[PDB]
């Protein structure tokens, strides 16, 4: 079960994989039975295959970047929370979306749950 | 207020940090639901209810040398929840220190905090 420093490393690695759009590697980070709520408030998605579909739809068109915008906060029970900005182009408008992800890892270092907090108030038009 | 909208969550969470920054313990307590929980740091057992929460804030802030400020926007959902990054400044071992924290909060249908989870550990403390 990852220590606080191992959670910092895994959550930063997740943002690196999203930033380069490596869909297959992101899926590998999740437990085969993980659940993702993105954005939090929506019905969850459950398991690897649904999760893969999610990342393929969100990142497969390219033109998405993601970067930490502050440090990962990590707990002593395998959990942590991080702030980051997602950049995209939405029907010609360059946009930034500010997001905080909360993750719980399992005893194999895989993401068991993820909750991404954001809504449209966190979108803005902004050059990369 | 009923269940706060995303914009209302952003305002309430920002207000909470303002009140921490000036040490207004009684106003902080009034932001929580009468039976709210606080987990601070997340990973420790929850405390329950306004008196335990008041005691916790009096212990944390009552020395008067704590400041706090947002270090990015409040993220808000459409179901009355939100998350925010901020930095707390205080003294550790005789020197000025800073601690990065993220709070995740859920508001009830009266606009009061029902649950508080403050994510941080020693990996977030710097001098
Ligand atoms: C899906 C998305 C691009 C990726 C992305 C979004 C929002 C939250 C995210 C959180 C993640 O952990 C990883 C990727 C996203 C955007 C919402 C609109 C959009 O095009
Ligand atoms: C208590 C504290 C100052 C305030 C504070 C801490 C940690 C998380 C917090 C979360 C809050 O929502 C409000 C205040 C704090 C610090 C931990 C050590 C310390 O001096």
UniProtKB/Swiss-Prot annotation, chain A:
Induction: By steroids. GO terms for molecular function: steroid Delta-isomerase activity. It holds the Pfam family SnoaL_2. Substrate binds at residue 101. InterPro entries: Ketosteroid_isomerase, NTF2-like_dom_sf, SnoaL-like. Signal peptide: none annotated. The keyword Lipid metabolism applies. It catalyses: a 3-oxo-Delta(5)-steroid = a 3-oxo-Delta(4)-steroid. The active site is at residues 14, 38. Keywords: Isomerase, Lipid metabolism, Steroid metabolism. Homodimer. This is Steroid Delta-isomerase.
């Amino acid at each position: 079960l990852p220590t606080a420093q191992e959670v910092q490393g895994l959550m930063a690695r997740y943002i690196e994989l999203v930033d380069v759009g490596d869909i297959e590697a992101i899926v590998q980070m999740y437990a085969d039975d993980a659940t993702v709520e993105n954005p939090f408030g929506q019905p969850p998605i459950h398991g690897r295959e649904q999760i893969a579909a999610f990342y393929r739809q969100g990142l497969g068109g390219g033109k998405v970047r993601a970067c930490l915008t502050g440090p990962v906060r990590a707990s002593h029970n395998g959990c942590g929370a991080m702030p980051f900005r997602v950049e995209m182009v939405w029907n010609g408008q360059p946009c930034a979306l500010d997001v905080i992800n909360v993750m719980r890892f399992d005893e194999h270092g895989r993401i068991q749950t993820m909750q991404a907090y954001w809504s449209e108030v966190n979108l803005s038009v902004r050059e990369p």
